[PDB]
């Protein structure tokens, strides 16, 4: 059996330098999403309080929920975004003026 053809194998790095890198920064925050929300609802319901059964969730909505969980700064200035439409004024306006007293002990008699 002749006429063997080979391709360059491996190309393993000869000057060592393999290095390593941890990856828990993103995997944990994304893996945790599927299981926690369900289980965090399963056990919390087991605690004795009810809410909506687990709906199937789409990636963007799950990311939004994780973002809401992460932002510990539960900004009260969303209520500021609303008081852009609020801060109502002049509801207790008067436009009526005072009555004074045009009295000099007038007598209408009878009564």
Author numbering: 41 to 151
Provide the authors' original text about this structure:
The non-myosin protein flightin reveals a newly resolved extension at the C-terminus that overlaps a previously unassigned density in both Drosophila and Lethocerus. Here with Bombus, we observe for the first time what appears to be the complete density of the part of flightin embedded within the thick filament from the C-terminus deep within the backbone to residue 41, the first part of flightin stabilized by contact with the proximal S2. The shape of this density strongly supports its assignment to flightin due to the presence of a folded domain in the middle in the predicted position of the “WYR” motif. For flightin, AlphaFold2 predicted a reasonable atomic model for the WYR domain corresponding to residues 56 to 102. The model of the two ends of the flightin density was rebuilt de novo using Coot. The density corresponding to the residues on the N-terminal side of the WYR motif of Bombus flightin, similar to that of Lethocerus and Drosophila, passes between the myosin tails of one curved layer to reach the outside of the backbone. The WYR motif itself is situated at the inside of the myosin tail annulus, where it contacts two curved myosin layers. The density on the C-terminal side of the WYR motif passes across a pair of myosin tails of one curved layer and ends up contacting yet another curved layer on the N-terminal side. Flightin’s interaction with five different curved layers possibly explains its impact on determining filament length. Our more complete density of flightin resolves the identity of the so-called “blue” density first seen in Lethocerus thick filaments and later in Drosophila.
Here, we report a thick filament structure from the indirect flight muscles of a third insect order, Hymenoptera, the Asian bumble bee Bombus ignitus. Flightin is essential for maintaining insect flight muscle structure and performance; when flightin is eliminated in Drosophila flight muscle myofibrils, defective myofilaments are formed and flight is severely impaired. Flightin sequences vary in length but have a strictly conserved region in the middle, dubbed the WYR motif that spans over ~50 amino acids that are critical for normal flightin function. The C-terminus is embedded within the backbone based on evidence that deletion of the C-terminus results in filaments of irregular length, whereas deletion of the N-terminus produces filaments of normal length but in flies that cannot fly.
